[PDB]
From a paper:
The most abundant flagellar building block is the flagellin protein that assembles in a helical pattern of more than 20,000 copies to form the extracellular filament. Successful assembly of the flagellar filament relies on the FliS protein that prevents cytoplasmic aggregation of flagellin10 and guides flagellin to the cytoplasmic side of the fT3SS. At the fT3SS, the flagellin/FliS complex interacts with the cytoplasmic domain of the fT3SS transmembrane protein FlhA (FlhA-C). Therefore, FliS acts as targeting factor directing its flagellin client to the export gate of the fT3SS for subsequent secretion.
To obtain the complete structure, the flagellin/FliS complex from B. subtilis was co-expressed in E. coli BL21(DE3) and co-purified by nickel-ion affinity chromatography (IMAC) followed by size exclusion chromatography (SEC). Crystals of the flagellin/FliS complex were obtained in two spacegroups, the primitive monoclinic space group P21 at 1.5 Å resolution and the primitive orthorhombic spacegroup P22121 at 2.1 Å resolution. The flagellin/FliS heterodimer shows overall dimensions of 95 Å, 40 Å and 40 Å and could be built to completeness except for the first 45 highly disordered residues at the N-terminus of flagellin (dashed line). The crystal structure suggests that the flagellin/FliS complex forms a rather compact particle detectable also in solution by small angle X-ray scattering (SAXS). The two proteins interact by an extensive network of hydrophobic and electrostatic interactions with an interface area of 2600 Å2 which can be divided into contact areas 1, 2 and 3. Contact area 1 involves the C-terminus of flagellin (D0-C) wrapped around the surface of FliS in an extended horseshoe like conformation with a mainly hydrophobic interaction area of 1600 Å (Contact area 1). Contact area 1 is highly similar to that in an earlier structure of FliS bound to the C-terminus of flagellin21 with a Cα r.m.s.d of 2.2 Å over 140 amino acid residues. Contact area 2 aligns FliS to the D1 core domain of flagellin, a region that was not present in previous crystal structures. Interactions within this interface are of more electrostatic nature (Contact area 2). Notably, residues 46 to 57 are kinked by 45° in the orthorhombic structure, while the helix is straight in the crystal structure derived from monoclinic crystals. Apart from this difference, both structure superimpose well with a r.m.s.d of 1.5 over 329 Cα-atoms.
Author numbering:
A (entry chain D): 45 to 304
B (entry chain E): 10 to 121
The structure:
């Protein structure tokens, strides 16, 4: 009897901690996803400004193109700001701290979620650098060459260079922006796949605790829950002494802990 | 400070503290979603979940009323987890409504 209750309490608490861990992890992933949605939107605005600056026949370099470039530089400063400030419990998620390290794998830092209560039950997550100097046209080795990152954009160069000019023509600078957009989209999609895995993990943990405790889990939609809530409220009112017997069974020390 | 209040509370008052605490954490979580603060959202939804689980686990299943209370707590727990996953303040307002129902009814019940 004691052995059964001890085994059950240990199972329940293990499931509860795994679920807390996994929800904490999904809230870190959501933090990164929300920040990258903003980076993506900034990059789309940069793209519009590059298209605008490409109309060099109607744009003056020292006024119009410089004004566009000043706006682009402020936007890429904001990309850098997002990459440097985005944090979860102090961990910088987007500045490359947690990137994959090909060149020196011992230096790689990972975001680890302990999603079960047992050995090996982890997910390991990496996030690439989402700063403006890390987005753009990548070399075969994953580096970015001079003039090929979002931080290097300079649309005033369009005034004096045809659109097909290597590296600095309109076509090449637009390609920097489009590669950056694809890289941010790819990073968002990879994090979304992690979020989907965590969601499935959390729902399995909830279902496991429900089966373990013989929970009544039949309420499965909002309108039914509303109806059953009114029923329960009325029965608390109409059978007050029964309600006290049913529920008024907590320990003060547990209540104190839960209200912290 | 608050230690005294839990230790001087009747059993009925202890449960009422839990209902009110659950409401506070749900409301903090909804504001955190509006603040785009995922970290604070999650912390408060876990605290709300833990109160619902404590209420469920301290039901006396020999009492007939416990069956319907437990079914509501199981739904509320699942709905708070889904609200955390989906960042859905409408789900929070839904569960806030149910907890308020229990709280208001419990407060009348413990009158005598």
């Amino acid at each position: 009897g004691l052995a059964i209750s001890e085994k059950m309490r240990g199972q329940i608490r293990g499931l509860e901690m795994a679920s807390k861990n996994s929800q904490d992890g999904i809230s870190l992933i959501q933090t990164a996803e929300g920040a990258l949605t903003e980076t993506h939107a900034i990059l789309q605005r940069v793209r519009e400004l590059v298209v605008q600056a490409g109309n060099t026949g109607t744009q003056d370099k020292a006024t119009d193109l410089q004004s566009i470039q000043d706006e682009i530089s402020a936007l890429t400063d904001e990309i850098d700001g997002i990459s440097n400030r985005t944090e979860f419990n102090g961990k910088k998620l987007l500045d490359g701290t947690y990137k994959v390290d090909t060149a020196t794998p011992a230096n790689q830092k990972n975001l680890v979620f302990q999603i079960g209560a047992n050995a090996t039950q982890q997910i390991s997550v990496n996030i690439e650098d989402m700063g403006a100097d890390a987005l753009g046209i990548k070399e075969a080795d994953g580096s970015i060459a001079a003039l090929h990152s979002v931080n290097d954009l300079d649309v005033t160069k369009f005034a004096d260079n045809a659109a097909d000019t290597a590296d600095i023509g309109f076509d090449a600078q637009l390609k920097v922006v489009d590669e950056a957009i694809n890289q941010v989209s790819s990073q968002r999609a990879k994090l979304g796949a992690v979020q989907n895995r965590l969601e499935h993990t959390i729902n399995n943990l909830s279902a496991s605790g429900e089966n373990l405790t013989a929970a009544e889990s039949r309420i499965r939609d909002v309108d039914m829950a509303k109806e059953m809530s009114e029923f329960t409220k009325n029965n608390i009112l109409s059978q007050a002494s029964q309600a006290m017997l049913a529920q008024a069974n907590q320990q003060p020390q547990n209540v104190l802990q839960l209200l912290r | 400070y608050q230690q005294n209040s839990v230790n001087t509370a009747t059993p009925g008052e202890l449960t009422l503290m839990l209902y009110n605490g659950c409401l506070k954490f749900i409301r903090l979580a909804a504001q955190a979603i509006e603040n785009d603060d995922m970290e604070r959202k999650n912390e408060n939804l876990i605290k709300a979940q833990n109160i619902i689980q404590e209420l469920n686990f301290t039901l006396n299943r020999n009492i007939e009323l416990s069956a319907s209370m437990g079914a509501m707590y199981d739904y509320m727990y699942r709905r708070l987890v889904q609200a955390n996953i989906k960042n859905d303040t409408g789900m929070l307002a839904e569960v806030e409504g149910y907890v308020t129902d229990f709280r208001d009814a419990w407060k009348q019940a413990i009158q005598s």
